[PDB]
A = this chain, B = another copy of it.
Amino acid sequence: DRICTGITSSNSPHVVKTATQGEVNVTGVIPLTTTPTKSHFANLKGTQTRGKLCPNCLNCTDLDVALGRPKCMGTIPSAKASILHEVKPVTSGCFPIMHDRTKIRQLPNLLRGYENIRLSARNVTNAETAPGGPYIVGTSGSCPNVTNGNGFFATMAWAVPKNKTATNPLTVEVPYICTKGEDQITVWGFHSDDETQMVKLYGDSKPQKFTSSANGVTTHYVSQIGGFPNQAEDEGLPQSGRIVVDYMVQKPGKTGTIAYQRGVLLPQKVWCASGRSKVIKGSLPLIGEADCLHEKYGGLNKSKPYYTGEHAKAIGNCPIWVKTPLKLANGTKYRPPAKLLK
């Protein structure tokens, strides 16, 4: 009589990849993959989330807040996670900007980069004592107030000069200003208007040259006089003119230099920001909570260790991306049932 060792034969539909034996059929398998499905973005668990530079700044754009518009001056805090919902962010009012002429649109998205950011604990450059003559701190309707006065971006001053005379380039020296080793984001620009209004406001009706230097980053502009493009991301009809606006990043301890003439939207309140936040292209009416924020798939939570599908930037407790679905053998190589015995 014969007693022997043996293994089973059973349904073995699952196939597993091995080194010595090529691809083999197996009794059972533990999957390690999943193809997640597109869902809405949530709030990463152990970290705080941003998708609106500011929550207590109400009905506004992030660019609006960035630029320092009147109402949109809600004091904005810290998250260590930030979603980027505005790839090309817009303004929702105030003075008409000719945006597409500077890197300015991304100011919010640069800000987003930081963990901490602040309106500003002061305002560099004394708009009145500014090089050039005395200026009236130009104010403007088209940018309401807490009371409906004359709004102009807490960011910057509308340097309209008493003694309207033409100017050879003048040089402001924008200082560091910031608490600790924060980064500083200076903002500034220039108003330009038509033939007539130019002479009326400042003593010159010719194209005005502007030039900034900051950490070896030179930029040079030339104002436009006539035929400005239609007004947009603004409100109500000071359409004689437009402000070309730009930002300047001053690293810790460093000084900026703006060469300017007439229309000079001098800087004022200047961002101080520091800390690094993990950012991701999100698309957000932010609903609820996930373990992991995938640029595609969105709010997602960690079931299996790897995931199959679309690779993309992703932050949090995320499954690792994988070329192909992978399975762990949980069983026995297929054997055909036996009667090859005697």
Q: Give the CA-CA distance A60 to B211 in the complex, in Å.
A: 34
CA distance A216 to B109 in the complex (A): 15
**Contact of A255 (CB < 8 Å), options: B100, B169, B216, B255:** B100
B-side contacts of A100, CB under 8 Å: 254-255, 257
Q: Does A219 contact B (CB under 8 A)?
A: yes
Q: With A and B bound together, what is the CA distance between A103 and B131 in angstroms? A: 25
Residue of B nearest to A251 (CB): B88
Give the residues in chain B near A218, CB-CB below 8 Å. 219-221
We find that the number of chain A residues with CB closer than 8 angstroms to chain B is: 31
A128 within 8 A of B: no
How far is it, in angstroms, between the C-alpha of A227 and the C-alpha of B132 when the chains are bound? 12
* Any B CB within 8 A of the CB of A207: yes
Interface: A287 (CB within 8 A)? no
A168 at the interface (CB under 8 A from B): yes
Please report the C-alpha to C-alpha distance between residue A321 and residue B171 in the assembled complex, in whole angstroms. Answer: 49
CB contact list, A183-240 vs B, under 8 A:
206-207, 209, 211, 213, 215-216, 218-222, 224, 226-227, 229
Within 8 A of B (CB), among A73-100: 100
Q: Are B101 and A257 in contact (CB under 8 A)?
A: yes
Are A207 and B168 touching (Cβ within 8 A)? yes
Q: Say whether A173 faces chain B, with CB atoms less than 8 Å apart.
A: yes
Interface centre among A106, A131, A220 (most CB of B within 10 A): A220
A48 adjacent to chain B (CB < 8 Å): no
Take A171-B222, A173-B229, A222-B171 as given contacts and tell me if A213 and B101 are in contact as well, using a CB distance cutoff of 8 Å. yes
**Is the Cβ of A211 less than 8 Å from the Cβ of B216?**
no
A215 CA to B209 CA in the complex, in Å? 19
Taking the nearest CB of chain B, how far is it from the CB of A190, in angstroms? 13
What are the 7 closest A-B residue pairs judged by CB atoms, nearest first? A103-B216, A222-B259, A169-B207, A171-B224, A220-B220, A100-B255, A169-B222
- The chain A residues found within 8 Å of chain B, CB to CB, are 100-103, 106, 131, 168-171, 173, 206-207, 209, 211, 213, 215-216, 218-222, 224, 226-227, 229, 254-255, 257, 259
Sample 25 A-B pairs with CB under 8 A, ordered by A number.
A100-B254, A100-B255, A100-B257, A101-B213, A101-B257, A102-B213, A103-B216, A131-B226, A131-B227, A168-B207, A169-B207, A169-B222, A170-B207, A171-B207, A171-B222, A171-B224, A207-B259, A209-B222, A211-B220, A218-B220, A218-B221, A220-B220, A222-B259, A224-B259, A229-B255
